[PDB]
């Protein structure tokens, strides 16, 4: 009764998966992660809910994670570029110990904080002065003569002492013509089909937190703990456990550490640790025992379903360099490395935690060490020297999740062993961006009609 004609519709609601460049959106502290170059966010970032649609998400193949990884590295670097390189400090250090014997149990130092003297060229090139500084054991190596760790083979750059590293939430925004889809399903688990899909121009803000073993200040699970993995059976993959409740962790570096300024060139000032006023103590972190016990009881129930009948064993890290085999976080520029042996202390039957005897202990303590020479991403980017920050440093954070790996999974005794392992920092960011996918919009479409043009 009619012929069909080709008509063009513009504003057609279709899309295809695509990877593009995202931009960021968000006091004179020069925050490195959230610079003044960020655009402001939309006060009313209205979310659009899709109808009966399905989409396939895969957090393990998500290019947003990879793009973030590169952005964090580029922001770390660059920010540290216009600063003192400390090459002149790579000289023989003549070191000795300090007297820590000034009842501070769980807080005592034992043979660390070495007193080193050195010969450094002053701001005037033909004049050499003897200078003194205290170093953390983990920052020096013996040749007693010492050298700064990692001087050979790398350049350690001092952060400019005005710049903050505090994480500030960063929102990722698609360019116009693109959109970010998110999976809101309670059943999503980081992979496969999702039926509750909505879209935004920008993601929620993500704090660019860097840590090892424990994920800090990320999002909590909406209701129940979710265990995510690319593969449960493959022991080589990281298992990300997202908590539905936070666990408080409180860390203290209880020393009156007063810094010293040393001129090692023409406007190049090195900030030394100076000395300690009062009784020197090691750093430590506390968590609530009751919270840890509840958290682990719920985690074992969940791991037990994945690995039924078998004994759940938690263990400490496998051993190695205390840069990557310990817990790590940053509070105000002080880099903490902490012993988590007490957190992954034991094993148990059923889903009943055990071997944490009832007693007056309320606070589980983790002994910590401080390093000034650090290597984020190991071989990627440059070594950095953290200035001391004047003493009495306290901070606290929200444990939002754990990174676990399986210890081979070759135990023939009906057990499974989990350790606070993990890989590259990509794992941390993957755990937060897991719900997002980037697509491109193709608004021009074609359909048959019954109209005809004059």
């Amino acid at each position: 009764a009619a012929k069909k004609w080709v008509t063009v519709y513009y504003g057609v609601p279709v899309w295809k998966e695509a990877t593009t460049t995202l931009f960021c959106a968000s006091t004179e502290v020069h925050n490195v992660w959230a610079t003044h170059a960020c655009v402001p966010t939309d006060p009313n970032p209205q979310e659009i809910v899709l109808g009966n649609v399905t989409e396939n998400f895969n957090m393990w193949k998500n290019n947003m994670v990879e793009q973030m990884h590169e952005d964090i590295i580029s922001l770390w670097d660059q920010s540290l570029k216009p600063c003192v390189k400390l090459t002149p400090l790579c000289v023989t250090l003549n070191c000795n110990n300090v007297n820590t014997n000034n009842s501070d149990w769980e807080k005592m130092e034992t043979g660390e904080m070495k007193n080193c003297s050195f010969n450094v060229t002053t701001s005037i090139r033909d004049k050499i002065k003897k200078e003194y500084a205290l170093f953390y054991k983990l920052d020096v190596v013996p040749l007693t003569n010492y050298r700064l760790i990692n001087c050979n083979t790398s350049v350690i750059t001092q952060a400019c002492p005005k710049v903050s590293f505090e994480p500030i939430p960063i929102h990722y925004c698609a360019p116009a013509g693109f959109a970010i889809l998110k999976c809101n399903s309670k059943t999503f688990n980081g992979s496969g089909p999702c039926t509750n899909v909505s879209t935004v121009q920008c993601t929620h803000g993500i704090r660019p937190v860097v840590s090892t073993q424990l994920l800090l200040n990320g999002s909590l699970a909406e209701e129940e703990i979710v265990i995510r993995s690319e593969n449960i059976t493959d022991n080589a993959k990281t298992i990300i456990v997202q908590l539905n409740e936070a666990v408080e962790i409180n860390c203290t570096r209880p020393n009156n550490n007063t810094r010293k300024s040393i001129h090692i060139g023409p406007g190049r000032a090195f900030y030394a640790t100076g000395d300690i006023i009062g009784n020197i103590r090691q750093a430590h972190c506390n968590i609530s025992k009751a919270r840890w016990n509840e958290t682990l009881g719920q985690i074992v129930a969940k791991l037990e379903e994945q690995f039924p009948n078998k004994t759940i064993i938690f263990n400490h890290s496998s051993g190695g360099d205390p840069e990557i085999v310990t817990h790590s976080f940053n509070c105000g520029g002080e880099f903490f490395y902490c012993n988590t042996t007490p957190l992954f202390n034991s094993t148990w039957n059923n889903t009943r935690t055990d071997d944490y005897p009832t007693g007056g202990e309320q606070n589980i303590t983790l002994q910590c060490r401080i390093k000034q020479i650090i290597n984020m991403w190991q071989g990627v980017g440059k070594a950095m020297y953290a200035p001391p920050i004047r003493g009495q440093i306290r901070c606290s954070s929200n444990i939002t999740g754990l990174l676990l790996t399986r210890d081979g999974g070759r135990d023939q005794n009906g057990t499974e062993t989990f350790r606070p392992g993990g890989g590259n920092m990509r794992d941390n960011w993957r755990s937060e961006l897991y719900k997002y996918k980037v697509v491109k919009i193709e608004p021009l479409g074609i359909a048959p009609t019954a109209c005809k043009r004059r």
Binding site: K3, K4, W5, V6, T7, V8, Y9, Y10, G11, V12, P13, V14, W15, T20, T21, L22, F23, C24, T35, A37, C38, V39, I48, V49, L50, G51, N52, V53, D71, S74, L75, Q78, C173, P175, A176, G177, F178, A179, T199, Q201, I441, E442, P443, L444, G445, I446, A447, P448, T449, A450, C451, K452, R453
Partner: protein, 120 residues
């Protein structure tokens, strides 16, 4: 109901319509690329609509018949009872054929015939 007929799931809507110094910083370079790209994508669609004579249209009507080799389903099988994403997949292989037909003769002849008619 033109935007409601082609599946209930037409809710992507038009997020693309919703959408300081140029410092070349780590975030700044990305911001520049985002702006340049948004312009390029906008213009690619607008230019194509311009070519077909659909520059000012939301829905434009043409003089090119449906052909039916692309899809032999009828209006109530394609227009109704279908979601736009499914539809674009169904005729994806004819995209260039159709675009070529939308320009060739359809705009080119239509305009040359008008040039002749306007001489009277």
């Amino acid at each position: 109901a033109a935007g409601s007929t082609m599946g209930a799931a037409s809710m992507a809507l038009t997020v693309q319509a919703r959408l300081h110094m140029l410092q070349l910083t780590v975030w700044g370079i990305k911001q520049l690329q985002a702006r340049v790209l948004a312009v390029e994508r906008y213009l690619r669609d607008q230019q194509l609509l311009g070519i077909w004579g659909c520059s000012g249209k939301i829905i434009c009507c043409t003089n090119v018949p449906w052909n039916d080799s692309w899809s032999n389903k009828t209006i109530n099988e394609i227009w109704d009872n279908m979601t736009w994403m499914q539809w674009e997949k169904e005729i994806d292989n004819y995209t260039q054929h159709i675009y070529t037909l939308l320009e060739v003769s359809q705009i080119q002849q239509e305009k040359n015939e008008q040039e002749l008619l306007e001489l009277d």
